[PDB]
Amino acid sequence: MNFKIKAKGHKNVLSLHKSTFEITKDKDLSLSGDCIIGLDIDKCMLDFPKEFKEKLANDETIVTVKLKSPNAYDEIVGYGHHDLTLDHPTDIVCRKSDFICSRTLMIKSDKAAIDLNRDLIEDLANGESLDVEIILS
Template identity: 60%
Template sequence: MRYSFHAQGHPNVTSAHKTTFEVTMDPEIGEAADCIIGVSSEKSMLNFPEEFKKAIAKNNSSIRVVLTTKNAYDEIKGTGNVSLSLDHPTDIVCRKSDYVCSRTLMIKSDKAACDLNPLLIEDLSKGEKLNVDIIVE
């Protein structure tokens, strides 16, 4: 199953966070928001189809997030969990840890913001469009 949407980069994207990365519907972020890589997302987890949410919210479901800008891409792998509510109205967070809250899309991510392709982050810090593809297997 695949779900795709767009977000935007922002001048304050630093991608320095060591345990998470986030895409948000919020249009602005501050300089301290070092996990946020995309703003003004056209979708939140509330928009995910129910069948898609059910596939994610299974223990050890395999999830891939593919991030693409005009000059770069990256692929992040993680897992789902039965405790994921997938109902946050604005934020989508991928975590290296097992921590689960309403903002969590996946846990046990193999990358955080600081691990992402530097060319991707360069595009995002210039405000380029971000394509987000979430694939559940």
Template identity: 55%
Template sequence: MTEYTFTAKGHHNVTSKHRTTFEVTQDLDIGLAADCIIGVASKASLNDMPPQMKDAIRNEAAQIQIILETKNATDKIIGYGHPALTLDHPTDIVCRKSDYTCSRTLMIHADKAAMDLNPDLIKDLKSGKTLKVTIII
């Protein structure tokens, strides 16, 4: 089991309405149209993940858990890795319900998207609270 933890921040424009993805980004600001972004000012991107973790994620059988935590709430998302994942985007980390892969994709076939996340977690993020993200392979 490999684990990687980092923090991001909530933002007043977090809407969490996207049906198929959620995203954490190093960008500092987002607009209302960015309905998949749940965290900004991330301290990590896919580029920052350790090489051994990337290797594990590229295994099609790899189950990936993401634990999202704020002051008042927690949520857990489960998805899967794939050999086509490059895991090299410099600013974004995207989790997808679909099987679409690109440089921004951390996992596919996720069991939750932005709209499925704990409402108390989203409330904290809308108020700008810190988001702790733990990725477990």
């Protein structure tokens, strides 16, 4: 019960944000974009099938986000909620808080951008590609 996204890295990836990480359809990354780890994503939340959206937008759902670069991997676990709308056209945000907006994939996550594996971030900052897998349980 999964969904896969491919993203590009970027020379400007820092991944230092303390409460979120984000992937975006945006192709370019400003110098100060410290929560963004993936660019030019192939698929956004508008591409999630109905069955995935319905299960994700549930207070009982556990959301596993697997991140893979050529040399490194990481795993984030966050939570579903009935209030998720999953309908922003360009951005996908994983949050440590329970704050919900149209960009929010999951809440109360164990990791923000700052917590992510530095080998994965050095792969992304050398513009290696990012594989994202979102798993519902």
